[PDB]
Structure 1
Amino acid sequence: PAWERHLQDVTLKEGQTCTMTCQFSVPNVKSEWFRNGRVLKPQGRVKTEVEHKVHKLTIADVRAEDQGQYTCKHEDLETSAELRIEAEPIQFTKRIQNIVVSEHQSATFECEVSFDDAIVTWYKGPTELTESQKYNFRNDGRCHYMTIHNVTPDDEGVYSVIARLEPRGEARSTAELKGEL
């Protein structure tokens, strides 16, 4: 009975899944996991696992709120390390892109972001777009949408999107619309 590999230190940032690991001298024997000295209960955002000799914790999409000491135990024998994670700028994993659409039709702007509890807001030049029989919005968790109904000569111009949460580098991207003849 001994840890053959201690818990490893992990540097990351918000908006990423984190797995943290160690290894015991005995196959599949379950460990007691802890964080900030508290019992690390597997509950949706937090998970823990055991293998044929390794032991695991996974935080599905880390928050800066999840940083600190993590610990893994087996009766008398324990190991511990730190998770270090900054507030990154909330940014796009796909980014919005330019569109060419014929005037009778619709134009579907689309993007996707780093982190699961994100909010989105849509724009044309300085003006924010409200849902007004012309600009239609949807979310699919990490993914965001703006459908524009009709693409007139006036509907051309710079559009933008804002990805936003708490005040962590609120990222912004643009895309120009074009009318097809």
Structure 2
Amino acid sequence: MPVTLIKDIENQTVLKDNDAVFEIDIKINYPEIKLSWYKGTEKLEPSDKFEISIDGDRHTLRVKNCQLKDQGNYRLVCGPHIASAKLTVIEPAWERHLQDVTLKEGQTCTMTCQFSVPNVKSEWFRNGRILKPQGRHKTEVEHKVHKLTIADVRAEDQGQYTCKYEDLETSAELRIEAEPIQFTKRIQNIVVSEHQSATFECEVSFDDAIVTWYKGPTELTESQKYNFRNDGRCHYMTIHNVTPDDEGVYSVIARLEPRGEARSTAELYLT
């Protein structure tokens, strides 16, 4: 037989800017027979892009600095034997991007993105500053998936989270919804005798809430008539010298950023 084939070429998948190597081991039994490499119609010749070499039965086509535009079929003819093989080139890139996530405080945050090359080393950033995997924050790479985990999220974790490989970034925002403020003890109706003082009292679920008190639609301010006291979660309004004009519906609105606000209503009566 004119030739004796031992291995043939195989498909090549390489990362962009790397070399690809197609090699065939073939014993040529008659000197006039030569192996030739082709890309489509062109017989390839040694150049800055293509290195062609021979070692005994081993013939090598090296494609230098592979680009996505180099992808396609590479083939050879060696007497009666012909063979073709495919070059695939992968550009490193973020295949699916970081997305915004919104969570309730206390939840576990999981943010993931997917790179085109598995097992690469990446760095995470919070608000532009590099993130170290400490304590509550953990970062991992699982094949192509890059994942940031933050346990027991609090409002202070809200911000920009970025994953970076070399100069390729993907980024998104983590937003945290704080537990809303509530009244743990609503104001309740009060009865006093005329000219006595009357003290409404309430309690909210968090300290240092800002309270505003009302009679009907009217905001009340500190005076000889209305005294206000706030102590941790408790809030009080005392109405001095209660007379019939002081009777009716009163309300309090408690506010604590970023936990919204809450409202409680009660009525004041004379005996």
Per the normalisation by structure 2, the TM-score is 0.38
The answer to which structure, 1 or 2, has the higher relative contact order (CA under 8 A, 6+ apart) is 1
Q: Determine the C-alpha separation between the residues in 2 that align with 1:49 and 1:2.
A: 18
Deviates most, 164-173 or 113-122? 164-173
Change (3 A) 1:151 1:58: farther
Note the C-alpha offset of 1:121.
1.1
1:15/1:115 contact within 8 Å kept: no
Higher-Rg member (1/2): 2
Deviation at 1:114, TM superposition (A): 1.3
Flag the 1:29–1:108 CA change in 2: closer, same or farther, 3 A: farther
Q: Percent identity, please.
A: 98
Root-mean-square deviation (Å): 7.8
CA separation of 1:70 and 1:157: change in aligned 2, threshold 3 A: same
For residues 3 and 105 of structure 1, the distance between their equivalents in structure 2, rounded to whole angstroms, comes to 72
Return 157-166 or 20-29, whichever deviates more: 20-29
Unaligned runs of 5+ in 1: none
Any conservation in 1 of the 2:248–2:267 contact (CA below 8 Å)?
A: yes
Deviation at 1:132, TM superposition (A): 1.8
Structure-2 separation of matches of 1:140 and 1:53 = 53
| Residue-by-residue CA offset, 1:61-95 (whole Å, 9 max, x unaligned) | 99522579999999999999999962233211111
Query: Quick check: 158-167 or 39-48, which moved more?
Result: 39-48
User: Are 2:226 and 1:135 equivalent residues in the alignment?
Assistant: yes
Unaligned runs of 5+ in 2: 1-91
The residue matched to 2:180 in structure 1 has which SS? coil
CA distances 1:131-165 after superposition (whole Å, capped 9, x unpaired): 12111000111110101102211101110001102
On the 8 A contact 1:115/1:142 being kept in 2, the answer is yes
Assess, with a 3 A threshold, how the Cα gap between structure 1 residues 123 and 32 changes in structure 2: closer, same or farther: farther
Aligned residues: 178
Runs (4+) of structure 1 moved beyond 4 Å? 1-63, 66-85
Taking structure 1 as reference, are residues 46 and 146 closer, same or farther at Cα in structure 2, changes over 3 Å only? farther
Distance of aligned partners of 1:27 and 1:67 in 2 relative to their CA distance in 1, 3 Å threshold: same
Distance 1:127 1:10, change over 3 A: same
Q: Relative to structure 1, is the Cα distance of residues 15 and 89 closer, same or farther in structure 2, using a 3 angstrom cutoff?
A: farther
